[PDB]
Design a protein around this ligand. Structure first.
Ligand code: BCL
Ligand code: BCL
Ligand code: BCL
Ligand code: BCL
Ligand code: BCL
Ligand code: BCL
Ligand SMILES: CC[C@H]1c2cc3[nH]c4c(c3C)C(=O)[C@H](C(=O)OC)c4c3nc(cc4[nH]c(cc(n2)[C@@H]1C)c(C(C)=O)c4C)[C@@H](C)[C@@H]3CCC(=O)OC/C=C(\C)CCC[C@H](C)CCC[C@H](C)CCCC(C)C
Ligand SMILES: CC(C)=CCC/C(C)=C/CC/C(C)=C/CC/C(C)=C/CC/C(C)=C/CC/C(C)=C/CC/C(C)=C/CC/C(C)=C/CC1=C(C)C(=O)c2ccccc2C1=O
Ligand SMILES: COC(C)(C)C/C=C/C(C)=C/C=C/C(C)=C/C=C/C(C)=C/C=C/C=C(C)/C=C/C=C(C)/C=C/C=C(C)/C=C/CC(C)(C)OC
Ligand SMILES: COC(C)(C)C/C=C/C(C)=C/C=C/C(C)=C/C=C/C(C)=C/C=C\C=C(C)\C=C\C=C(C)\C=C\C=C(C)\C=C\CC(C)(C)OC
Ligand SMILES: [Ca+2]
Ligand SMILES: [Ca+2]
Ligand SMILES: [Ca+2]
Ligand SMILES: [Ca+2]
Ligand SMILES: [Fe+3]
Lengths: 319, 60, 280, 40, 258, 60, 60, 60, 60, 40, 60, 60, 40
């Protein structure tokens, strides 16, 4: 346990905290809290209780159907031979409906199960979003999490709702497969002229990167200032403290400007939530609005120019 | 437009500037949004038919 | 110009090299030894990067030479020279400029070091920033070295360094199958999943519903305990994050390094070791 | 703000006047162009 | 992004739509980034930026209103805070230059040892009891089954010499954890609190290593008003004292290495 | 300009320098945003039409 | 200057130095930005045509 | 100096140091900019014409 | 020393050590910047010709 | 600010002799260049 | 020792411990940065003239 | 070693571990930083010629 | 700083001599070089 506020050297335990009182109508928490010395050596040790109401139960049950369907077909292709199942797991996956069905409901064989397990996974998330909304207002909390989770969901549906349907073919939808879905994103790009030139795709990376960047700063800074109680952000947001009182000066002296203990968390939010925002878009545009982002770039004089040390002929025009 | 009489009451729940500027914003976007959508397929009044092409004949 | 609470912190000392000399503040920034250093690299390089836009692929009078931020590019020398300095024109710029990158990045960290040394804060930030720099030291030094050619580096072109990422990527076919690469990716995603979660919660407890007080850590814990059961902890997240962030970069560094020096075949194939296992 | 109509107009004078010093020197600019390298 | 455009299409009609929202959001943020600190104090180095300005690109925002919980006051952001005090003299009449701590920098309360006057009250839990308290009050808290007990270990010091021995540790009701250590200085025989952040463990020799300040410095550590609860005011002024050591506990530290 | 009398009160809800500079911005920005959006598509006055390529007519 | 007469009232809502320098900025940008855009595809005047005679000829 | 002789009272709001160096640094950034932009396309006094095209002539 | 006369007063504004070394920085970054930009295109005096043609006698 | 009128004079001189110093040094080498090998 | 005249006074604004070791670091690098820039094209003494054909003569 | 006459004073303002191991580190890096470059250019003695019989011919 | 005229003065010389001891030590460097191989 090296102390750079990395691992809690000495842990202590108190009676299982059954969460704070909820409002009327909200079922009582369930689950006997557990304690883990190891886990707790990372952060908190106590576990649960967990809430589970209508939306919750309706969700945990819903999406649990999709997962089954998927894992089922997977173990199905392997001819129910677990041996080869745990072998080709990565490869195994529930493929979408063939283009010879458009959007029509295909038979369980040719793409059916996918669609089904899809809607069950589509609503499973939409429903889960409400589940979170019910956990916010029940605690007088705001909906910053729902707003974000929403954004993510946006891009999630772009991969099936808004784009595929806008294309008129369930073929342009990601498959239920660890590896095969990697090929999806692998093919999509190839199909649309290289996402490197797709504007939104870049903007989105700036976030996948920025995101990682900030937390690398914040998560760190808070620790570096964890000495002066820099982890207790809440009472810091209310009445500024010494932690946040030097915590900024650092950044200020280093990069010139800075933000407040609260402020930053707002940047982080928009630097992360905006990630998928530029995600669903960059994909909502591809296939529909644009078809070849390479020529699209050069069309606007984007694509860089390189000398010609290597070039190939074209047997088509020739022959 | 008779409703005008009992309509006043509305302001009693919606704040003065809360929904005031909330609209000044909805329009702004919706505006540029429309010209934008219209400019695409509906009718590219700017560079389509008339007088377009003059940027080529006598232009260059 | 200082913040409402700055003056009482601008203490003298805590310098690594020739501090007393440059030990002072220029606006909201700090100089010191490393302060001047980085600058001596900034303009010496930033301008060279411009000189490249000026000059161009072949010449300043060429039709290739452009100033479009997108088309701008500063590619390294051929793989012929290997570990040799190529003509400033034919790769020289990149080579030199890059040497300025390390002088800027590293110094920038070192500068942060003593900066923290003054605030008596933790050296987390810099140590964290190290990885980023380290990752760079891999995409230009480590990898190229084990490849025997400074030409293996990536072009310094806003969009130019994307192709270098596409080729080297496909150079191993479906680059999506890289173990380290995958792993790393997960982290980048987890991280973003963390931010979207952390930042959100804070604002959701310090700015609750209308006519509501500022919630306490008492809620935070319950909140995530009612949606998924467990709550990592206050600083825990600030730990977890820092972890993901670094881990994301670390595993990535490995990701590209292994690609080439430690593997020439196609990544998709590497996974075969799992297949050719005497179990199936 | 932070001043009455007394030094609010005095500044306005210098401000306004000089403001024309540009509208004019900027018109001679464009006009100087309209004569050298024209456009449309 | 080109100065002149000859190509028009939907893809690009949405891109700019973003940058506008971006250029706007970045401002929204900036505004918030000024709810603590600004306005600035001097003019050592005239605000630097592509476009100077009086106080940044975005005008200061409107004071937000924070309703603390029960039995609490109210906070506003931003707020007009009265000027602080500097117990240090300018190392040079030239702006930017640092300020030398007067007297013993270990307690000059400047820079590393300098801490703002936090509310002279105490943080509480959800119900209303002081959040952070000593185990001598936390009747429920016990050392994790297995993890070695701190209570009884001898707190060593920077120079190495022992400064005292732990008599108790302060746990946190709100967030289960150990935040402070009720240390019993040998010299003054007083009882000062020790922050985790600076508290290091050596379960082998039953100690709580500290590189912050010397064993002798543990003597005049910001005392606490009520030994049954730590005040936010003092709490922040506490662990801040140790910070000084991080840069004053030894002339060598502040001194250059090369 | 009817009710222009009743419209004066507005300042009592919104501030003077709030909607003031807010206009300067939304406008001033719209300015460039316009010439641009038009600079391309319709009458790319800069490089579409006359005057005749200074480079070709002038140089040659 | 005619407008100035009564327009001195505006200096009670907008800071003198703020509006002064704030614009000093928008000027350099709006400026620098113009020669660029006009030097991008409009008639380049730098080396578009004459006197590029020695530019490309004098060399060889 | 028709205007400036009258506007001298302007350093009353813009302290010297502030805009003295503000303008100071800006000169170089621009100095190197133009100087360089010029060196870029307009002409390359380096090898563009004279004196001897050394790389081609000088060597031998 | 034309302007340097009344330029003595400048020192209150610009400090000694502050802008004293700041300059030392620019020069250095510049010094290289030149030799660099120059040694590239114009007359790569380094390895292009004489003296002694040690790069035309050895390599060849 | 940093000094008073006197010290301001004292430095303006000593350094001024140093600034040119570089400069003169500059021309001799900028010249030597022009003389030995002509650019343009 | 021309500038040695009154240059003595400069040690007051410049600290020995710093300016001296500081230079050391800057000096060094500058040197290797030189060899480096020079050893590149000017003359790669290693393999350039003699007696460097160890591989071409040995490998074969 | 002229300077080394009065240089004795060096240690009065520098500590022992300061430049002692300081240079030590700078030697290792430059140390191997040099076999490095030297091993690449002129004589890749590591592999380029003799002796290459037992390895090369041994492979045939 | 940290010193007075009298003090810093006695060390101005000592320093200066050395920088030249090297400024010279190096002149010999360029010296022997140009002799062996000549550049430009
Ligand atoms: C990591 C694997 C590849 C790589 C893959 C990609 C991919 C894939 C993408 C980028 C993208 C970007 N990359 Mg890259 N990139 C690499 C290494 C670098 C290095 C480097 C020093 O090593 C730099 C400076 C950049 C810089 C950049 C940005 C231009 C752009 C925005 C990213 C972002 O938002 O991050 C988060 C951080 C921030 C927003 C804050 C700071 C970043 C700023 C905005 C970028 C300034 C760069 C500037 C032009 C350099 C010259 C500075 C001079 C002083 C003017 N890349 C390596 C070789 N990069 C994205 C893009 O759109 O490219 C066009 C993108 O999609
Ligand atoms: C065909 C192309 C291949 C491919 C080919 C490659 C190749 C080839 C590489 C990667 C690399 C990476 N790829 Mg991949 N990759 C593909 C598809 C993907 C997908 C996807 C969803 O499809 C994802 C998420 C990724 C993700 C990633 C990252 C894990 C990794 C970049 C790591 C990093 O953190 O560098 C962190 C950052 C840096 C090195 C830069 C250092 C930052 C410096 C210090 C700061 C700059 C400051 C600047 C100067 C100042 C700016 C401010 C201005 C002054 C204003 N790849 C496809 C399949 N990928 C790279 C990698 O593995 O790197 C280890 C790599 O080399
Ligand atoms: C394209 C056709 C023409 C051409 C047409 C024009 C036109 C038309 C105009 C210019 C203008 C300018 N051109 Mg031209 N120009 C050409 C080719 C060039 C080339 C070139 C290398 O080829 C260059 C380097 C320039 C350079 C310049 C600049 C000198 C000038 C910048 C104006 C500006 O926006 O300031 C931005 C302004 C500011 C930052 C400040 C605002 C000014 C106020 C009134 C003064 C400040 C008061 C202050 C508060 C008092 C304190 C004093 C100090 C600030 C401390 N042109 C070609 C030949 N050019 C502009 C100009 O000269 O205006 C006079 C202009 O209108
Ligand atoms: C390109 C055509 C010519 C050529 C033409 C020129 C010309 C023309 C010039 C140079 C100049 C220089 N050339 Mg040449 N040069 C060539 C080839 C070379 C080669 C080479 C390997 O081929 C090299 C290594 C150099 C190297 C150099 C540098 C020694 C010198 C840059 C000085 C400078 O900017 O300081 C930057 C400045 C500073 C760091 C500080 C400011 C100086 C002040 C006055 C002193 C500091 C005061 C301080 C406060 C006191 C404390 C002292 C210590 C710091 C503690 N040249 C070719 C052959 N070269 C310049 C020169 O030598 O001027 C005399 C110059 O004008
Ligand atoms: C390219 C044409 C020539 C050539 C021309 C030159 C020229 C011309 C020069 C060199 C110089 C050098 N060359 Mg050569 N060189 C060639 C080929 C080589 C090869 C090779 C393998 O082929 C090598 C390894 C070298 C190696 C070297 C270095 C020994 C030396 C760089 C010194 C330096 O930068 O100090 C950097 C400085 C410092 C670290 C500090 C400042 C120095 C002060 C005076 C001493 C320190 C004082 C301190 C405060 C007191 C404490 C003492 C200790 C630090 C504790 N050359 C070819 C043949 N070379 C330089 C030289 O020899 O200088 C004597 C030089 O001017
Ligand atoms: C083929 C050999 C290479 C070469 C290889 C190397 C190598 C290798 C090294 C150097 C090093 C240095 N070289 Mg050399 N150098 C060459 C050509 C030059 C030229 C030139 C104009 O052509 C110049 C100006 C320089 C200048 C310099 C210095 C910057 C530096 C010694 C620093 C110092 O102590 O400054 C103190 C200086 C001053 C206070 C300023 C006052 C300058 C006055 C005017 C005296 C200048 C006279 C000059 C030295 C003689 C040139 C002779 C001409 C050929 C006739 N070189 C040729 C092209 N040079 C070393 C280095 O930089 O270490 C850090 C090093 O290791
Ligand atoms: C695991 C580490 C994570 C991380 C952490 C991190 N980054 C950091 C820090 C930390 C802790 C800082 O403290 C530092 C910072 O912002 O300090 C205020 C920083 C930083 N992270 C940055 C960028 C960045 N980080 C990235 C990633 C990450 N940062 C990781 C997720 C990425 C990418 C590619 O995803 C980028 C782009 C900077 C904003 C900043 C460091 C700025 C700095 O030190 O700049 C120094 C140099 C200059 C200003 C001048 C450079 C000019 C040179 C002479 C030329 C160099 C040429 C260059 C190589 C060409 C690039 C061209 C490309 C456009 C193709
Ligand atoms: C074509 C054309 C016309 C061009 C015109 C060109 C013109 C006019 C140019 C003139 C203008 C010029 C030269 C401008 C130069 C500006 C320069 C050089 C700025 C340099 C500064 C610089 C490189 C900054 C990098 C900033 C970056 C990229 C940061 C990335 C991370 C990020 C999103 C930061 C924003 C939020 C902040 C400040 C986070 C830091 C931060 C973190 C991370 C905490 O955890 C924390 C905890 C508690 C309190 C505060 C903080 C805190 O501030
Ligand atoms: C009792 O008191 C006692 C005696 C004990 C006190 C004792 C005191 C002691 C022992 C003091 C010792 C003092 C010492 C050793 C002082 C030493 C001073 C020295 C050595 C100073 C040296 C200065 C060197 C300088 C400033 C060199 C400057 C070089 C410059 C600026 C070079 C510029 C080069 C350029 C731009 C090169 C460009 C090359 C190209 C063109 C290739 O770059 C692209
Ligand atoms: C047998 O299994 C047991 C019981 C042992 C349980 C084990 C299960 C296991 C191991 C499961 C493993 C599952 C795995 C590995 C799944 C991996 C999935 C992956 C990698 C998925 C990747 C991407 C998926 C995407 C992008 C899915 C998108 C889905 C969408 C957009 C669905 C949309 C559905 C819609 C719009 C439905 C609309 C309703 C209708 C069709 C009626 O509208 C007309
Ligand atoms: Ca597939
Ligand atoms: Ca036209
Ligand atoms: Ca010429
Ligand atoms: Ca030559
Ligand atoms: Fe946080």
């Amino acid at each position: 346990p090296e102390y750079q506020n990395i691992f809690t050297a000495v842990q202590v335990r108190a009676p299982a905290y059954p969460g704070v009182p909820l409002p009327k109508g909200n079922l009582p928490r369930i689950g006997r809290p557990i304690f883990s010395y190891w886990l707790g050596k990372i952060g908190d040790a106590q576990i649960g209780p967990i809430y589970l109401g209508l939306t919750g139960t309706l969700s945990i049950f819903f999406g649990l159907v999709a997962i089954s369907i998927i894992g089922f077909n997977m173990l199905a292709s392997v001819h129910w031979d677990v041996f080869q199942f745990l072998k080709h797991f990565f490869w195994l996956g529930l493929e979408p409906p063939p283009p010879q069905y458009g959007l029509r409901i295909p038979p369980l064989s040719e793409g059916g199960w996918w669609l089904m397990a899809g809607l069950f996974l589509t609503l499973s998330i939409l429903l889960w979003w409400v589940r979170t909304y019910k956990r916010a207002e029940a605690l007088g909390m705001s909906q910053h999490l729902s707003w974000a989770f929403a954004a993510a969901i946006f891009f999630y549906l772009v991969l099936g709702f808004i784009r595929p349907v806008m294309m008129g073919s369930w073929a342009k939808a990601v498959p239920f497969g660890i590896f095969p879905h990697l090929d999806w994103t692998a093919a999509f790009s190839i199909r649309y002229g290289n996402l490197y030139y797709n504007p939104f795709h870049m903007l989105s990376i700036a976030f996948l990167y920025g995101s990682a960047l900030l937390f690398a700063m914040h998560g760190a800074t808070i620790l570096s200032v964890s000495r002066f109680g820099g982890d207790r952000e809440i009472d810091q947001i209310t009445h500024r403290g010494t932690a946040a009182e030097r915590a900024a000066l650092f950044w200020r002296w280093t990069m010139g400007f800075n933000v407040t203990m609260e402020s930053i968390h707002r940047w982080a939010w928009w630097c992360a939530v905006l990630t998928v925002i530029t995600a669903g878009i960059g994909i909502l545009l591809s296939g529909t609005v644009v078809d070849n982002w390479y020529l699209w770039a050069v069309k606007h004089g984007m694509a860089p120019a390189y000398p010609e040390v290597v070039t190939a002929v074209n047997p088509y025009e020739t022959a | 437009f008779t409703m005008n009489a009992n309509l006043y009451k509305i302001w009693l729940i919606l704040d003065p500037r809360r929904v005031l500027v909330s609209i000044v914003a909805f329009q702004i976007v919706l505006g540029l949004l429309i010209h934008m959508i219209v400019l695409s397929t509906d009718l590219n009044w700017l560079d389509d038919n008339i007088p377009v092409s003059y940027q080529a004949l006598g232009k260059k | 110009a200082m913040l409402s609470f700055e003056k009482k912190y601008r203490v003298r000392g805590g310098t690594l090299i020739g501090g007393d000399l440059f030990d002072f503040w220029v606006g909201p920034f700090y100089v010191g030894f490393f302060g001047v250093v980085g600058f001596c690299f900034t303009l010496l390089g930033v301008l060279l990067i411009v000189w490249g836009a000026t000059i161009g692929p072949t010449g300043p009078t060429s039709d290739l030479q452009t100033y479009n931020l997108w088309r701008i590019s500063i590619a390294p020398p051929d793989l012929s020279y290997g570990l040799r300095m190529a003509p400033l024109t034919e790769g020289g710029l990149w080579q030199i400029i890059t040497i300025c990158a390390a002088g800027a990045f590293i110094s920038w960290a070192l500068r942060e070091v003593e900066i923290c040394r003054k605030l008596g804060i933790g050296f987390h930030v810099p140590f964290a920033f190290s990885f980023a720099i380290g990752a760079y030291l891999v995409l230009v030094f480590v990898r190229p070295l084990l490849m025997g050619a400074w030409g293996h580096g990536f072009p310094y072109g806003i969009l130019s360094h994307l192709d270098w990422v596409s080729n080297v990527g496909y150079q191993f076919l479906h680059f999506h199958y890289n173990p380290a690469h995958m792993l790393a990716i997960s982290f980048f995603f987890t991280n973003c999943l963390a931010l979207s979660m952390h930042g959100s919660l804070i604002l959701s407890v310090t700015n609750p519903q209308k006519g509501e007080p500022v919630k306490t850590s008492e809620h935070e814990n319950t909140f995530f305990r009612d949606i998924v059961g467990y709550s990592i902890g206050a600083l825990a997240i600030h730990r977890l994050g820092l972890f993901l962030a670094l881990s994301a970069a670390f595993w990535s560094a490995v990701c590209i390094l292994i690609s080439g020096p430690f593997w020439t075949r196609g990544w998709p194939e590497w996974w075969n070791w799992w297949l050719e296992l005497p179990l199936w | 703000t932070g001043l009455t109509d007394d030094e609010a107009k005095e500044f306005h004078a210098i401000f306004m006047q000089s403001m024309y010093a540009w509208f004019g020197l900027v018109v001679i600019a464009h006009l100087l162009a309209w004569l050298y390298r024209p456009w449309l | 992004s080109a100065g002149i455009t000859h190509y028009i299409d939907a893809a690009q009609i949405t891109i700019w739509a973003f940058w506008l929202f971006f250029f706007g959001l970045i401002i929204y943020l900036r505004r918030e980034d000024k709810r603590e600190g600004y306005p600035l104090d001097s003019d050592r180095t005239e605000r630097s930026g592509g476009r100077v300005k009086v106080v940044g690109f975005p005008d200061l925002p409107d004071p937000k209103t924070f309703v603390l919980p029960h039995n609490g006051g109210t906070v506003v952001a931003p707020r007009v805070e009265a000027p602080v005090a500097v117990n240090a003299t300018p190392f040079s009449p030239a702006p930017g230059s640092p300020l030398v701590p007067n007297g013993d920098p270990m307690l000059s309360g400047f820079g590393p040892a300098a801490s703002p006057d936090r509310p002279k009250h105490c943080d509480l839990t959800f119900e209303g009891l002081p959040k952070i308290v000593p185990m001598r009050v936390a009747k429920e808290f016990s050392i994790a089954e297995g993890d070695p007990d701190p209570r009884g270990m001898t707190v060593v010091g920077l120079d190495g010499e022992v400064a005292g021995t732990v008599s108790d540790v302060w746990v946190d009701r709100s967030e289960p954890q150990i935040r402070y250590l009720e240390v019993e200085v040998a010299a003054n025989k007083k009882k000062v609190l020790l922050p985790i952040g600076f508290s290091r463990f050596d379960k082998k020799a039953r100690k709580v290593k500290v590189d912050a300040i010397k064993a002798a410095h543990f003597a005049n550590v910001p005392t606490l008003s009520n030994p049954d609860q730590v005040t936010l005011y003092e709490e922040d002024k506490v662990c801040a004292y140790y910070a000084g050591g991080k840069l004053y506990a030894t002339a060598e530290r502040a001194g250059p290495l090369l």
